């Protein structure tokens, strides 16, 4: 019911299970629900910073992509043109915006009120943060509103459902495809966001360098060729010279040690 089968390729979970996984994942899960958090701190702004040889605070630094008018006696100095403006409006604040990719403008200001904090607080409540709102005929007696049969408006799992509904992928989903363990980039979210604490210089430098590698991977994709033919293990398995069995991982590792030692010796 939960998995497609022993091939282990697709999963389908219920709301309470997803809620439990989301709750257990709090130390490693992503908590930034507001997309505006990434303003001038996203893939495209890093691409622009690289193209413009401009480095915003906490952002990656790269080699420069490229090696009478506007004289100071003719310029009205009112506000310094910050580097953030050069990536925010790269065509307006730069004379030669070569290789620039125009960014996403903005997202509506987030108003998601948070919950799951006090065990008995309901799903619907007027949170302290909200401003107050300070401003004959007859029908058959059996006539009633739709869904009047259900007295409970809020069900026991409603708060969890609303929380999962706002969570970033993958806790946002109830079904999906399996992925390789190596494809789950657990720590990636930490460096894609600003440092959570005022860490030492070496830590901030590590954040910046991890971001640099990320930006380079995004800028230079290497698409796989559709020619799936001749994969090694499947090719070897087709011969009579290779056989298959099941063994403990430690046994397989020890065998590989002995085999490699024999090969090199």
């Amino acid at each position: 019911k939960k998995v497609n089968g022993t091939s282990y390729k697709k999963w389908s979970f219920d709301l309470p299970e997803m809620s439990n996984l989301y709750r257990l994942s709090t130390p490693l899960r992503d908590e930034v629900t507001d997309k505006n958090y990434y303003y001038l701190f996203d893939k495209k702004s890093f691409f622009n910073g690289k193209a413009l040889n401009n480095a915003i605070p906490g952002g990656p630094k790269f080699e420069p992509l490229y090696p009478e008018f506007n004289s100071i006696d003719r310029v009205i100095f009112r506000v310094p043109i910050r580097s953030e403006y050069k990536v925010a409006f790269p065509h307006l604040y730069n004379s030669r915006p070569r290789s620039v990719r125009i960014p996403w403008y903005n997202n509506p200001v987030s108003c998601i009120i948070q919950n799951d904090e006090e065990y008995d607080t309901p799903a619907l409540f007027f949170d302290p943060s909200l401003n107050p709102i300070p401003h004959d005929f007859t029908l058959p007696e059996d006539f009633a509103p739709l869904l009047a049969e259900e007295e409970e408006l809020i069900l026991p799992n409603t708060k969890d459902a609303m929380s999962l509904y706002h969570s970033p992928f993958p806790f946002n989903r109830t079904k999906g495809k399996m992925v390789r363990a190596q494809d789950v980039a657990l720590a990636k979210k930490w460096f894609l966001q600003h440092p959570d604490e005022e860490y030492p210089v070496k830590v901030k430098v590590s954040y910046q360098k991890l971001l640099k590698n990320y930006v380079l991977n995004e800028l230079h994709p290497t698409l796989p060729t559709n020619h799936n033919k001749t994969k090694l293990l499947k090719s070897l398995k087709n011969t009579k010279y290779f056989q298959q069995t099941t063994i403990d991982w430690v046994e397989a590792g020890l065998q590989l040690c002995r085999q490699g030692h024999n090969m090199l010796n």
Partner: peptide, 26 residues
């Protein structure tokens, strides 16, 4: 501020050493 998970102050939920629910070297 009191931690939502364990009540102890000084750390936020994500930094909590208690499972989510509902001396040091010189």
């Amino acid at each position: 501020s009191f931690c939502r998970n364990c009540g102890e102050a000084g750390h936020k939920e994500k930094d909590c050493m208690e499972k989510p629910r509902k001396l040091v070297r010189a």
